[PDB]
Design a binder for these strands. Structure first.
Length: 739
RNA sequence: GCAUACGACCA
DNA sequence: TGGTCGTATGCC
């Protein structure tokens, strides 16, 4: 397959390198023939004679147009003639594009900021991560002793299919070395010997490689982890960094893991238990540092690091196939895709499709234009949830509401308010009209995407091969991720194919279909909807049973599916015996089997009493199973009364901006602001554990660091009341009554 | 983008 | 007793 592409400059000329793995052997293909370019839309053909002579200066070097080609391309569904201006080097375009753009016969320029390697991959039609080539994997970690990298790293731990080892400065896997220099040299020898394609880390982009470069510079080590002898190439991405290893794919899992799940804690043990359900030993850096001088508990830490290497490898085995599939589907390298945002992912996909279909790509918005489209966007339809628990309530939701709308109504800038067409669709309450005579750009690609996903699903059902089945699952989920990113692109501020009207029309169409479905389910099938959110609703019968529920629900489903247009379709996903809905996006429902699922309630909010969980679950389990609403309150009041005494024994907010920049001062911010005079260093993402003592004054005034939980009756009265006041009000029990 | 809670200030 | 503004955090 193809692993990555880059370019080096040889005698002022750019040479593309394609890293490949064919039949078990790493290979580098060189291309010296590709040339950067832009497109220029001119007042008249004549003007090229003046424009082709436009020159600039880069470093004392004159930059000239190498050659030109007149080309006919489609722009927003309409034909356009432009001039392709080629150049010698990628760096020449930034130097000369402004002068070309300023010239008076040049109406505009286009496609001037595409990075060279990506551009090469698109224009050649080359696709990374294709085929059945097997890629060797290697995971590693480092443990240091607690300014940055002043302390040495105590050990380095690596894991692969055959096992995990630890190279630190008395055990089969662990190797103990004389010094830190020897340990890093040994780790490098290990990586060179095994020669892996994928290097797996956890937060390696911003911790492990930076630390290693600092320690190598301090010890004068050439850390040539690359297959071309190169050192890791640091890169700046946003306010953070990414690290690349030439000839390999450095797979950092932290950016990927952040995008897949929404765990409150994102340390390796936390994600590992989320993904596999198994505990992971946790070792703090300070504990590891003490072992070196003492010599004791070396194995414990070496086991806490060995296990980190192993879990990093395991998470990498489980996450690499999905990213490889996304890479295949977007048409860019894994390194890029695994680190990129969904907006950029759609952009890369569309730019490839555009080059395939000879469509000229719109420019990224300028800063003024960016502000012009930064106005508020209308949200999805939500009904305030009916308070209290309900009986025999059923959940129905649309399949792919927004993609299905875009395909059914052909929503695209290409088709917006086009004149002279036989057929049109009209958006509700915003009135936009979309032509139905020819398929739009996005609607076309979206339709093919959904087609392919359906084909893959059927192939999944009919295959005997369990490996192929797992593979196709990955592929179809990748398609779902891309297809669902497409609506976001219509309203994406930085999008090239931005279309305000398309976005609002999609939202309006979604709301119309949802509310109309609810209207007819009540008016024509006698149903009450308890709660709804943008693409689905919880509704029920006043009196009926589970079998009744199902049989009756499918009548409405067929009726409405026959009336629903095209791909628009509603389905039955949830049977639930009783539901407790507290507010929008905050509910608890329990199923016929006895499982209960939580959304938005206090349980999953990071600010919460640790031990109030038992009574929270009991209140939900009594409310939802027993259905007795005084039982819930006599439970709450009995726990409160028993917490008076003779009860068996049983608060951190992150700072996002610096205290000088903070507009106000909250109780946790007063602690951090005071710490600045106390000096212990504070940074975005660190956590304020604070307490409030029983004393007169402002709440910022009385907030204290935590090291400076007693639960002696009053603690139970700190934020418990809000956590159940609305929950328990539905049943007539006031805040005052509970205490 | 929506949504929840309240912190801070002001009456 | 009632308001605005702003902060930390969860969803679809």
């Amino acid at each position: 397959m193809i692993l990555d592409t880059d370019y080096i400059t040889e005698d002022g000329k750019p040479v593309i390198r394609i890293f490949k793995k064919e039949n078990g052997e790493f290979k580098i293909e060189y291309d010296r023939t590709f040339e950067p370019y832009l497109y220029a839309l001119l007042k008249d053909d004549s003007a090229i004679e003046e424009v082709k002579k436009i020159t600039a200066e880069r470093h004392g070097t004159v930059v000239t147009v190498k050659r030109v080609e007149k080309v006919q391309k489609k722009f927003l569904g309409r034909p356009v003639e432009v001039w392709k201006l080629y150049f010698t080097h990628p760096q020449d375009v930034p130097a000369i594009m402004d002068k070309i753009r300023e010239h008076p016969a040049v109406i505009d320029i286009y496609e001037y900021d595409i990075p060279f390697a990506i551009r090469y991959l698109i224009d050649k039609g080359l696709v990374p991560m294709e085929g059945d080539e097997e890629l060797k994997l290697l995971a590693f970690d480092i443990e240091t002793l607690y300014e940055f990298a002043e302390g040495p790293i105590l050990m380095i731990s690596y894991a692969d299919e055959e096992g995990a080892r630890v190279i630190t400065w008395d055990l089969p896997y662990v190797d103990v070395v004389s010094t830190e220099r020897e340990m890093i040299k040994r780790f490098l020898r290990v990586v060179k010997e095994k020669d892996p394609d994928v290097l797996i880390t956890y937060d390696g982009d911003n911790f492990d490689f930076a630390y290693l470069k600092k320690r190598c510079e301090k010890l004068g080590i050439n850390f040539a982890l690359g297959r071309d002898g190169s050192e890791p190439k640091i890169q700046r991405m946003g306010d953070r960094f990414a690290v690349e290893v030439k000839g390999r794919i450095h797979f950092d899992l932290y950016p990927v893991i952040r995008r897949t799940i929404n765990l409150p804690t994102y340390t390796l043990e936390a994600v590992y238990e989320a993904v596999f359900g198994q505990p992971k030993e946790k070792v703090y850096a300070e504990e590891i540092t003490t072992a070196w001088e003492t010599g004791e508990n070396l194995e414990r830490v070496a086991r806490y690091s060995m296990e980190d290497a192993k879990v990093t490898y395991e998470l990498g085995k489980e996450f690499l196939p999905m990213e490889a599939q996304l890479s295949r589907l977007i048409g860019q390298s894994l390194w890029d895709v695994s680190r990129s945002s969904t907006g950029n992912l759609v952009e890369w996909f569309l730019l490839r499709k555009a080059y395939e279909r000879n469509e000229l790509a719109p420019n990224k918005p300028d800063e003024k234009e960016l502000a012009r489209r930064h106005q508020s966007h209308e949200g999805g339809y939500i009904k305030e949830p009916e308070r209290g628990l309900w009986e025999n309530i059923v959940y129905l939701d649309f399949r792919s509401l927004y993609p299905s709308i875009i395909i059914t109504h052909n929503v695209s800038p290409d088709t917006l308010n086009r004149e002279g067409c036989k057929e049109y669709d009209v958006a509700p309450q915003v009135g936009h009209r979309f032509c139905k005579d020819f398929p739009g750009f996005i609607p076309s690609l979206l339709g093919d995407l959904l087609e392919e996903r359906q084909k893959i699903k059927k192939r999944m059902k009919a295959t005997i091969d369990p490996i192929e089945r797992k593979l196709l699952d990955y592929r179809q989920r990748a398609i779902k991720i891309l297809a669902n990113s497409l609506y976001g692109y219509y309203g994406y501020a930085r999008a090239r194919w931005y279309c305000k009207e398309c976005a609002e029309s999609v939202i309006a169409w979604g709301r119309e279909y949802l509310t109309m479905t609810i209207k007819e389910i009540e008016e024509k099938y006698g149903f009450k909807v308890i709660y709804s959110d943008t693409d689905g609703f919880f509704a029920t019968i006043p009196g009926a049973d589970a079998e009744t529920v199902k049989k009756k629900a499918m009548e409405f489903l067929k009726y409405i599916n026959a009336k629903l247009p095209g791909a628009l379709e509603l389905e039955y996903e949830g049977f639930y015996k009783r539901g407790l809905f507290v507010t929008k996006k905050k509910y608890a429902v329990i199923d016929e089997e006895g499982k209960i699922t939580t959304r938005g309630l206090e349980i999953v909010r990071r600010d919460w009493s640790e031990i109030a969980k038992e009574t929270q679950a009991r209140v939900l389990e009594a409310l939802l199973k027993d259905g007795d609403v005084e039982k819930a309150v006599r439970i709450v009041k009995e726990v409160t009364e028993k917490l008076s005494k003779y009860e068996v024994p049983p608060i951190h907010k992150q700072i996002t901006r610096d205290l000088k920049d903070y507009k106000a001062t909250g109780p946790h911010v007063a602690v951090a602001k005071r710490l600045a005079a106390r000096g212990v260093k504070i940074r975005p993402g660190t956590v304020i554990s604070y307490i409030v003592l029983k004393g007169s004054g402002r709440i910022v005034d009385r907030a204290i660091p935590f090291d400076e939980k007693y639960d002696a009756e009053y603690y139970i009265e700190k934020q418990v009341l809000p956590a159940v006041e609305r929950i328990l009000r539905a049943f007539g029990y006031r805040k005052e009554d509970l205490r």
